[PDB]
Design an enzyme around this catalytic site. Structure first.
Site, PDB file in Angstrom:
ATOM      1  N   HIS A   5      11.970  10.827   4.385  1.00 34.16           N
ATOM      2  CA  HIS A   5      11.013  11.511   3.497  1.00 34.16           C
ATOM      3  C   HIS A   5      10.057  12.393   4.289  1.00 34.16           C
ATOM      4  O   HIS A   5       9.397  13.286   3.720  1.00 34.16           O
ATOM      5  CB  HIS A   5      10.285  10.515   2.609  1.00 34.16           C
ATOM      6  CG  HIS A   5       9.101   9.877   3.252  1.00 34.16           C
ATOM      7  ND1 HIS A   5       9.118   8.584   3.729  1.00 34.16           N
ATOM      8  CD2 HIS A   5       7.845  10.345   3.460  1.00 34.16           C
ATOM      9  CE1 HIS A   5       7.911   8.274   4.188  1.00 34.16           C
ATOM     10  NE2 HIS A   5       7.120   9.329   4.047  1.00 34.16           N
ATOM     11  N   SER A  35       4.214   6.794   8.362  1.00 26.30           N
ATOM     12  CA  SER A  35       5.609   6.937   7.896  1.00 26.30           C
ATOM     13  C   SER A  35       6.560   7.287   9.018  1.00 26.30           C
ATOM     14  O   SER A  35       6.277   8.160   9.862  1.00 26.30           O
ATOM     15  CB  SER A  35       5.728   8.025   6.828  1.00 26.30           C
ATOM     16  OG  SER A  35       5.256   7.566   5.566  1.00 26.30           O
ATOM     17  N   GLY A  36       7.703   6.606   9.014  1.00 24.01           N
ATOM     18  CA  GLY A  36       8.743   6.884   9.990  1.00 24.01           C
ATOM     19  C   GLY A  36       8.641   6.037  11.261  1.00 24.01           C
ATOM     20  O   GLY A  36       9.614   5.900  12.024  1.00 24.01           O
ATOM     21  N   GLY A  83       0.751   8.997   7.295  1.00 26.38           N
ATOM     22  CA  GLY A  83       0.864   9.394   8.692  1.00 26.38           C
ATOM     23  C   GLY A  83       1.559   8.367   9.560  1.00 26.38           C
ATOM     24  O   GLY A  83       2.014   8.711  10.655  1.00 26.38           O
ATOM     25  N   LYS A 133       7.990  -9.002  -7.279  1.00 25.65           N
ATOM     26  CA  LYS A 133       6.939  -9.395  -8.220  1.00 25.65           C
ATOM     27  C   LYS A 133       5.720  -8.476  -8.158  1.00 25.65           C
ATOM     28  O   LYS A 133       5.015  -8.297  -9.152  1.00 25.65           O
ATOM     29  CB  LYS A 133       6.534 -10.864  -8.016  1.00 25.65           C
ATOM     30  CG  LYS A 133       7.650 -11.855  -8.336  1.00 25.65           C
ATOM     31  CD  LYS A 133       7.220 -13.316  -8.160  1.00 25.65           C
ATOM     32  CE  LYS A 133       8.458 -14.226  -8.200  1.00 25.65           C
ATOM     33  NZ  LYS A 133       8.162 -15.679  -7.993  1.00 25.65           N
ATOM     34  N   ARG A 134       5.496  -7.851  -7.001  1.00 26.75           N
ATOM     35  CA  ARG A 134       4.348  -6.982  -6.792  1.00 26.75           C
ATOM     36  C   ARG A 134       4.612  -5.519  -7.144  1.00 26.75           C
ATOM     37  O   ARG A 134       3.668  -4.730  -7.218  1.00 26.75           O
ATOM     38  CB  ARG A 134       3.917  -7.038  -5.326  1.00 26.75           C
ATOM     39  CG  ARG A 134       3.642  -8.419  -4.774  1.00 26.75           C
ATOM     40  CD  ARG A 134       2.631  -9.149  -5.623  1.00 26.75           C
ATOM     41  NE  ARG A 134       2.485 -10.540  -5.204  1.00 26.75           N
ATOM     42  CZ  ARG A 134       1.948 -11.493  -5.962  1.00 26.75           C
ATOM     43  NH1 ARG A 134       1.499 -11.209  -7.181  1.00 26.75           N
ATOM     44  NH2 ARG A 134       1.854 -12.731  -5.498  1.00 26.75           N
ATOM     45  N   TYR A 135       5.887  -5.151  -7.304  1.00 25.75           N
ATOM     46  CA  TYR A 135       6.275  -3.784  -7.644  1.00 25.75           C
ATOM     47  C   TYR A 135       7.167  -3.751  -8.884  1.00 25.75           C
ATOM     48  O   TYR A 135       8.327  -3.373  -8.811  1.00 25.75           O
ATOM     49  CB  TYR A 135       6.984  -3.105  -6.456  1.00 25.75           C
ATOM     50  CG  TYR A 135       6.003  -2.710  -5.379  1.00 25.75           C
ATOM     51  CD1 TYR A 135       5.875  -3.491  -4.210  1.00 25.75           C
ATOM     52  CD2 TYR A 135       5.227  -1.560  -5.501  1.00 25.75           C
ATOM     53  CE1 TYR A 135       4.976  -3.151  -3.219  1.00 25.75           C
ATOM     54  CE2 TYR A 135       4.294  -1.213  -4.507  1.00 25.75           C
ATOM     55  CZ  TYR A 135       4.199  -2.007  -3.371  1.00 25.75           C
ATOM     56  OH  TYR A 135       3.303  -1.636  -2.413  1.00 25.75           O
ATOM     57  N   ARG A 136       6.607  -4.171 -10.022  1.00 24.73           N
ATOM     58  CA  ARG A 136       7.395  -4.327 -11.277  1.00 24.73           C
ATOM     59  C   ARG A 136       8.055  -3.061 -11.832  1.00 24.73           C
ATOM     60  O   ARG A 136       9.065  -3.133 -12.548  1.00 24.73           O
ATOM     61  CB  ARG A 136       6.561  -5.022 -12.369  1.00 24.73           C
ATOM     62  CG  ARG A 136       5.979  -6.359 -11.902  1.00 24.73           C
ATOM     63  CD  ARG A 136       6.115  -7.485 -12.915  1.00 24.73           C
ATOM     64  NE  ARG A 136       6.039  -8.780 -12.226  1.00 24.73           N
ATOM     65  CZ  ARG A 136       5.548  -9.900 -12.751  1.00 24.73           C
ATOM     66  NH1 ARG A 136       5.071  -9.916 -13.994  1.00 24.73           N
ATOM     67  NH2 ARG A 136       5.528 -11.013 -12.025  1.00 24.73           N
ATOM     68  N   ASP A 154      15.720   5.625   2.982  1.00 28.82           N
ATOM     69  CA  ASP A 154      14.689   6.432   3.643  1.00 28.82           C
ATOM     70  C   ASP A 154      14.857   6.279   5.145  1.00 28.82           C
ATOM     71  O   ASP A 154      14.140   5.516   5.819  1.00 28.82           O
ATOM     72  CB  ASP A 154      13.308   5.990   3.174  1.00 28.82           C
ATOM     73  CG  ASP A 154      12.203   6.980   3.568  1.00 28.82           C
ATOM     74  OD1 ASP A 154      10.999   6.631   3.411  1.00 28.82           O
ATOM     75  OD2 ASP A 154      12.567   8.078   4.034  1.00 28.82           O
TER      76      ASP A 154
END
Length: 238
Positions: free
Chosen positions: A44, A188-189, A186, A160-163, A93
């Site tokens: 990404h 990321s990766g 920043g 459960k935290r990302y429904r 990703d």
């Protein structure tokens, strides 16, 4: 990195800072040295990057202040993005950068081992996330490489935290129930590095999350062990 502390110089020698030179030079993302010509990072990060010509990889860096117009860097010959990648939250990703020249390994810059399909069963209890990213949700890139120790959470717990998302087996999550320590913009990766039997392994690649370091919102990382076949396929000469 939210809730972290400054790294010791050379303690994460696989960590690189990937810069773009467009429009002017700045840190774009983190990445990890996995081979003499190869950096593993997040797909990404390459949104709107139309050519590898604008990329510069710097290794052996602690402080962004070390990077000046006269600092040596590695050019990028090729960006290899996973062909199933569409966006961070949908998985896949992962990207490879093929460098124009090879890294000469040293105490300051050396590769991290990929995870073994055999250590999928292992309970990694010593995992760290690193990077030059924000220290709060709206902030700026940090000078000194930060580190934070963060526990892995099970995919069932993360789900459960990302429904509104599907947390797949090709993702791994890490965070504290109460929040406070996490990757942020920043980072990321960059790597989620875990130390097991005295060897560091690249377990995750910093990918996405809802905000940074919020209660009950663990960070989501690419589960690198699910891509070792892909990495092998893409880094072989043809």
């Amino acid at each position: 990195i939210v809730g972290g502390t400054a790294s010791v110089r050379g303690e994460w020698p696989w960590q690189v800072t990937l810069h773009t030179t467009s429009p002017t030079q700045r840190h774009l993302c983190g990445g990890s040295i996995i081979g003499n010509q190869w950096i593993l990072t997040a797909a990404h990060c390459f949104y709107g990057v139309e050519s590898p010509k604008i990329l510069r990889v710097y290794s052996g860096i602690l402080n962004q202040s070390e990077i000046k117009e006269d600092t040596s860097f590695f050019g990028v010959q090729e960006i290899i993005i996973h062909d199933q990648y569409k966006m961070a939250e949908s998985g896949y990703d992962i990207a490879l950068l093929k460098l124009e020249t090879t890294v000469n390994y040293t105490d300051s810059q050396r590769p991290i081992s990929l995870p073994s399909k055999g250590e999928r069963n292992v309970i990694y209890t010593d995992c760290w996330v690193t990077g030059w990213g924000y220290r709060k949700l709206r902030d700026k890139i940090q000078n000194t490489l930060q580190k934070a120790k963060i526990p892995l959470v099970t995919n069932e717990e993360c789900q459960k935290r990302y429904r509104g998302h599907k947390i797949t087996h090709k993702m791994i999550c890490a965070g504290y129930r109460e929040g406070g320590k996490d990757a942020c913009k920043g980072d990321s990766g960059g790597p989620l590095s875990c130390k097991h039997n005295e060897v560091w392994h690249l377990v995750g690649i910093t990918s996405w999350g809802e905000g940074c370091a919020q209660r009950e919102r663990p960070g989501v990382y690419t589960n690198v062990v699910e891509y070792v076949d892909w990495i092998l396929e893409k880094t072989q000469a043809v």
